[PDB]
Amino acid sequence: VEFGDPELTARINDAMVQVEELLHTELSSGEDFLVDIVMHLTRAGGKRFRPMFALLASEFGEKPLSENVIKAAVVVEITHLATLYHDDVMDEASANARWDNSVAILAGDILLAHASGLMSQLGTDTVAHFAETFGELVTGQMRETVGPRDTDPIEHYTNVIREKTGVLIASAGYLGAMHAGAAPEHIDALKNFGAAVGMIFQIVDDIIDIFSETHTPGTDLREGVFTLPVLYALREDTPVGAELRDILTGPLEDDETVNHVLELLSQSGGRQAALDEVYRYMDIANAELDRLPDSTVKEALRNLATFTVKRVGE
Amino acid sequence: VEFGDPELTARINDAMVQVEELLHTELSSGEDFLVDIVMHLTRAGGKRFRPMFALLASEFGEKPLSENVIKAAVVVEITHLATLYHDDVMDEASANARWDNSVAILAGDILLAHASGLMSQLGTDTVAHFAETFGELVTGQMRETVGPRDTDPIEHYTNVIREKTGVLIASAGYLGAMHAGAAPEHIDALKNFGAAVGMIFQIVDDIIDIFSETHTPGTDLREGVFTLPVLYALREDTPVGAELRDILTGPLEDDETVNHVLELLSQSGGRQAALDEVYRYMDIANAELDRLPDSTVKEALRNLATFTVKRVGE
Numbered sequence: 237v238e239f240g241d242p243e244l245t246a247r248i249n250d251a252m253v254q255v256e257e258l259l260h261t262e263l264s265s266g267e268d269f270l271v272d273i274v275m276h277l278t279r280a281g282g283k284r285f286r287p288m289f290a291l292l293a294s295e296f297g298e299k300p301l302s303e304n305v306i307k308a309a310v311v312v313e314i315t316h317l318a319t320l321y322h323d324d325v326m327d328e329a330s331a332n333a334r335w336d337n338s339v340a341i342l343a344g345d346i347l348l349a350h351a352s353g354l355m356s357q358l359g360t361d362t363v364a365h366f367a368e369t370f371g372e373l374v375t376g377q378m379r380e381t382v383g384p385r386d387t388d389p390i391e392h393y394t395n396v397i398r399e400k401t402g403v404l405i406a407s408a409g410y411l412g413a414m415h416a417g418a419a420p421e422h423i424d425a426l427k428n429f430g431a432a433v434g435m436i437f438q439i440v441d442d443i444i445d446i447f448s449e450t451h452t453p454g455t456d457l458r459e460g461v462f463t464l465p466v467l468y469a470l471r472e473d474t475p476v477g478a479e480l481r482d483i484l485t486g487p488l489e490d491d492e493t494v495n496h497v498l499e500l501l502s503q504s505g506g507r508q509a510a511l512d513e514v515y516r517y518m519d520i521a522n523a524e525l526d527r528l529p530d531s532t533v534k535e536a537l538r539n540l541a542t543f544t545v546k547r548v549g550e
Numbered sequence: 551v552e553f554g555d556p557e558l559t560a561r562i563n564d565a566m567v568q569v570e571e572l573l574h575t576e577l578s579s580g581e582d583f584l585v586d587i588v589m590h591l592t593r594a595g596g597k598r599f600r601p602m603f604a605l606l607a608s609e610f611g612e613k614p615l616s617e618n619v620i621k622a623a624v625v626v627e628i629t630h631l632a633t634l635y636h637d638d639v640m641d642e643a644s645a646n647a648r649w650d651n652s653v654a655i656l657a658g659d660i661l662l663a664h665a666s667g668l669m670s671q672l673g674t675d676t677v678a679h680f681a682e683t684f685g686e687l688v689t690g691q692m693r694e695t696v697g698p699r700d701t702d703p704i705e706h707y708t709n710v711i712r713e714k715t716g717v718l719i720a721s722a723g724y725l726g727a728m729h730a731g732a733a734p735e736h737i738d739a740l741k742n743f744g745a746a747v748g749m750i751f752q753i754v755d756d757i758i759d760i761f762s763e764t765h766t767p768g769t770d771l772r773e774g775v776f777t778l779p780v781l782y783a784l785r786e787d788t789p790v791g792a793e794l795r796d797i798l799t800g801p802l803e804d805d806e807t808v809n810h811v812l813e814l815l816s817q818s819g820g821r822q823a824a825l826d827e828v829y830r831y832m833d834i835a836n837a838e839l840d841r842l843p844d845s846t847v848k849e850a851l852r853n854l855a856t857f858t859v860k861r862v863g864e
């Protein structure tokens with residue numbers, strides 16, 4: 237990406253190239269018929285936020301951007317891609333679709349095999365950390381799939397994001413810093429910062445989905461997914477809260493009902509409630525950066541979080 | 551199981567209990583809603599052939615049946631269960647079935663997370679070995695899914711079994727022996743023996759599916775899966791080979807066509823061709839046991855293979 241420091245920008249950009257090379261090698265490893273399938277399902281790329289965060293984190297150690305830092309970053313990104321493959325097959329909830337599903341399940345699995353190969357060269361602490369991280373991630377997908385049962389819907393939603401999204405970003409910071417040989421306190425801070433940042437990104441995304449116009453809103457609503465601002469509004473002891481409770485159980489479908497709900501939400505206190513929750517995570521993020529030495533990298537991380545927050549408020 | 555040595559029988563049976571305990575702990579670890587799902591999909595158990603083979607293999611090391619041997623065995627069995635979960639979802643090729651599929655995909659994934667936790671305590675060599683093994687296994691499932699393309703159907707079939715089945719049994723022998731501290735030659739022999747045995751079990755199973763009566767035959771045929779004896783028969787320059795080629799492309803369905811094919815196969819040389827291939831693997835198996843010290847455990851392994859072979863010939 238682009239930071240204040242142009243010296244930083246260049247170092248990082250060079251490392252991102254090394255990450256992309258090793259990643260491509262792994263995605264294209266194996267028997268022809270299998271590689272063909274993986275390459276056809278290749279997502280067409282991404283922002284690579286997770287490996288970049290791992291690279292930034294490594295700047296706090298004695299060996300920034302070293303070969304094992306690049307390898308850890310690739311492990312994190314491979315894991316990310318594997319989960320997308322498995323998540324996509326489940327978003328699907330005749331025989332040319334049952335084939336498509338087998339294929340993506342196996343693509344996700346071969347990716348995990350590749351990731352494990354690299355982790356074997358990174359050490360058992362990485363494997364242990366990965367096992368916990370991937371377990372959490374899978375727990376988040378299961379949690380989302382089963383729903384809130386009879387728990388508080390806001391706690392459920394928070395848990396789903398912490399697990400499905402937060403932990404892997406926390407892991408990028410952890411592994412980036414650890415394989416750079418950073419101090420334990422700094423490793424821990426970057427891990428915690430990643431977790432807080434994961435919460436910020438998702439809640440901000442959810443706010444935008446409901447309250448913004450153009451770069452149509454209400455995507456989550458149509459699918460029947462009620463995110464933080466909606467959950468807060470449904471809680472209110474007001475006429476708007478009451479009307480939202482009475483509508484948001486029945487048939488979700490026609491555009492007119494969706495647009496009425498969207499207006500109700502704009503009349504509710506849900507946006508600001510979600511935004512205050514974003515601010516609380518930003519306070520957490522800032523407290524973690526507090527544990528790190530002042531530097532342009534620290535400020536680049538702070539800005540990553542702050543810029544996201546500013547998409548929805550100040 | 552039951553071997554000649556009753557002293558062996560007791561040692562092994564005690565270790566299998568320890569394997570079952572740790573396995574159950576892992577399958578039942580995690581959040582309530584996730585454990586509930588895993589336990590509901592628990593296969594209802596199995597023969598545990600793979601962990602038993604790992605335990606037998608460890609008898610050739612300085613530390614037979616030690617705690618890490620038990621842990622390796624559980625890793626192999628967890629991996630086995632994970633692949634079944636993913637394989638089952640693909641054998642499936644409306645919304646209460648799309649839910650069932652997400653669930654099994656995630657169950658297989660949480661199992662891999664559990665396996666990785668244990669491997670982190672077993673060392674990087676185990677993780678490396680696992681990465682290769684699981685990669686092969688996934689390659690076999692993909693290979694079966696895509697079909698033989700334009701390769702020799704017999705080579706394809708052999709590759710599918712070596713990868714889908716053989717490698718994990720080879721891995722049980724490898725890991726059992728290695729974590730017992732066996733000598734490299736012995737570790738290697740037990741690994742190779744496991745691979746040969748995997749081929750024997752599957753080909754014998756396929757022969758039985760076609761040529762036996764009661765403990766109905768032709769399961770694979772109905773599903774359109776042509777195993778070794780069928781592939782050999784389809785190769786023959788005889789009237790029976792010609793008639794099989796002309797039938798085994800068209801509509802596979804009615805019982806009368808199935809039963810006619812079954813009779814044709816009994817008139818062909820396919821059974822004996824498959825059986826000679828079994829004998830060739832048995833020769834390989836015996837050559838591997840040759841590398842191991844004489845002992846009741848060696849003979850128990852030999853008998854495991856020999857007893858299987860005798861289900862279909864002498």
Ligand code: DMA
Binds near residue numbers: 327401
């Ligand atoms: C593993 C993982 C988080 C996949 C995508 O999750 P998501 O459902 O938040 O993404 P999308 O909404 O695009 O399906």
Ligand code: DMA
Binds near residue numbers: 634715
């Ligand atoms: C991972 C794995 C080998 C699952 C079962 O394979 P299979 O298709 O041979 O078993 P089944 O024939 O019972 O589906």
Ligand SMILES: [Ca+2]
Binds near residue numbers: 324327
């Ligand atoms: Ca999804």
Ligand SMILES: [Ca+2]
Binds near residue numbers: 441442445
């Ligand atoms: Ca969104």
Ligand SMILES: [Ca+2]
Binds near residue numbers: 499502
């Ligand atoms: Ca309004």
Ligand SMILES: [Ca+2]
Binds near residue numbers: 637638641
């Ligand atoms: Ca199957």
Ligand SMILES: [Ca+2]
Binds near residue numbers: 756
């Ligand atoms: Ca069978």
Ligand SMILES: [Ca+2]
Binds near residue numbers: 816817
């Ligand atoms: Ca006959």
